[PDB]
């Protein structure tokens, strides 16, 4: 209901109040209580200040200002994320009397080793730098009872995972772990069973991965859209493709326009019959027509191979929708291509979504490598 219902320090609640949060978003309602009891957490949820606070709030609750040692280590892959995180930390922990230091690859080692001479309670840093300072004995983690990984999936890749495990060596044998991620698959479970203890798993997203899928956006005016789509049909090697629109009307009109140009295609949407929907679905899976235009695919069937190109004719408003449209279910690196058509009023939704799902939607290049949407 409210943050006050979580029985937190006065100063922490003050911090939240000044920060302007009124009611806890669901990730906070789920994680904040479980975290403040000591239990480990493995959560999947979209990125945001909401989630960052969903773990920063417990951190500020646990750490004792009176003890001048590192009591919480917050690992992040990129420096900008260390910045944003530490910013949320300083904000919410405004009245808590708690020092938060950032230590990354972009910074100077000398200034960081110098900074660590003074009191630091919550350390926020990237794998390399943190392991460096840890090995150096510059950063004392003997009383660091709390370990956190935001965008954890980015740091459990082949190389980083080693560094993470080497950092974890310094932490006390008995320590709390909080692992957060946007994108579903986890590289290893040996890591999990070894380094986590009775973790309370949270999952607030569909089980879909953008792994292997190369994402591009293209700023295209509303009137210029069809021309652009044709240019893509002409310039891209497609065995089969799916187009997405934000309205049934636009779906039908676009499908009919595509058939009018000279490409055989089917269409589906919610306002269509269920039986007819699944019918067109299977018919498309067969490969009768080389394209489909659809508003919704509530029905989920794993990982259709044939499709190699996905296009958002209309950019979605929310990251859930975008994920449902682009995300494939196969845990393994499903190979695909996604092209988004960016309206003037979608420029923000692109920034937001790109951020929430923790993925990269780069500007569409003239020369798209054929290795990315066919093999």
């Amino acid at each position: 209901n409210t943050f006050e219902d979580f029985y937190l320090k006065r100063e922490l609640l003050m911090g939240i109040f000044e920060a302007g949060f009124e009611k806890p978003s669901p990730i906070q309602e789920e994680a904040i209580p479980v975290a403040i009891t000591g239990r480990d957490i493995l959560a999947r949820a979209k990125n945001g200040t909401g989630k960052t606070a969903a773990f920063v709030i417990p951190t500020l609750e646990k750490v004792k200002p009176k003890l001048n040692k590192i009591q919480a280590l917050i690992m992040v892959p990129t420096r900008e994320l260390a910045l944003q995180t530490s910013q949320v930390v300083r904000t919410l922990g405004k009245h808590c009397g708690i020092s938060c230091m950032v230590t990354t690859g972009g910074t100077n080692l000398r200034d960081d080793i110098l900074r660590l001479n003074e009191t630091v309670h919550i350390l926020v840093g990237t794998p390399g730098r943190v392991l460096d300072l840890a090995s150096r004995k510059v950063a004392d983690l003997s009383d660091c009872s709390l370990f956190i990984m935001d965008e954890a999936d980015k740091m459990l890749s082949r190389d980083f995972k080693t560094i993470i495990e080497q950092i974890l060596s310094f932490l006390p044998p008995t320590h709390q772990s909080l692992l957060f991620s946007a994108t579903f698959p986890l590289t290893v479970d040996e890591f999990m069973d070894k380094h986590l203890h009775k973790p309370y798993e949270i999952n607030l997203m569909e089980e879909l991965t953008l792994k292997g899928i190369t994402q591009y956006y293209a700023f295209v005016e509303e009137r210029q859209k069809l021309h652009c789509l044709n240019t893509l049909f002409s310039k891209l090697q497609i065995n089969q493709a799916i187009i997405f629109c934000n309205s049934t009307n636009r779906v039908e009109l676009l499908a009919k326009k595509i058939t009018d140009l000279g490409y055989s295609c089917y269409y589906s949407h919610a306002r269509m019959k269920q039986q007819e929907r699944n019918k067109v679905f299977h018919e498309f899976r067969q490969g009768k027509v080389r394209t489909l235009v659809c508003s919704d695919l509530l029905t989920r069937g794993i990982d259709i191979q044939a499709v190699n190109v996905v296009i958002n004719f209309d950019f979605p408003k929310t990251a859930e929708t975008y994920l449902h449209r682009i995300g494939r279910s196969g845990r393994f690196g499903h190979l695909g291509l996604a092209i988004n058509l960016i309206n003037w009023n979608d420029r923000f939704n692109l920034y937001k979504i790109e951020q929430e799902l923790g993925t990269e939607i780069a500007a569409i290049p003239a020369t798209i490598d054929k290795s990315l949407y066919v093999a």
């Binding site: 293209a218 700023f219 295209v220 005016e221 509303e222 009137r223 210029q224 859209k225 069809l226 021309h227 652009c228 044709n230 240019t231 002409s234 310039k235 309205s247 009307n249 636009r250 009109l253 326009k257 009018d260 140009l261 000279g262 003037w344 420029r347 500007a363 569409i364 003239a366």
Partner: peptide, 29 residues
């Protein structure tokens, strides 16, 4: 309702192929 269809009648179907790079500069307005 929809605006594009009048905008891009299928039948003429002719233009110098759409250039993305030029519109990517119009990203800021």
């Amino acid at each position: 309702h929809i605006d594009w269809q009048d905008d891009d009648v299928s039948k003429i179907k002719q233009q110098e192929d759409f250039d993305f790079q030029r519109n990517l500069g119009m990203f800021n307005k």
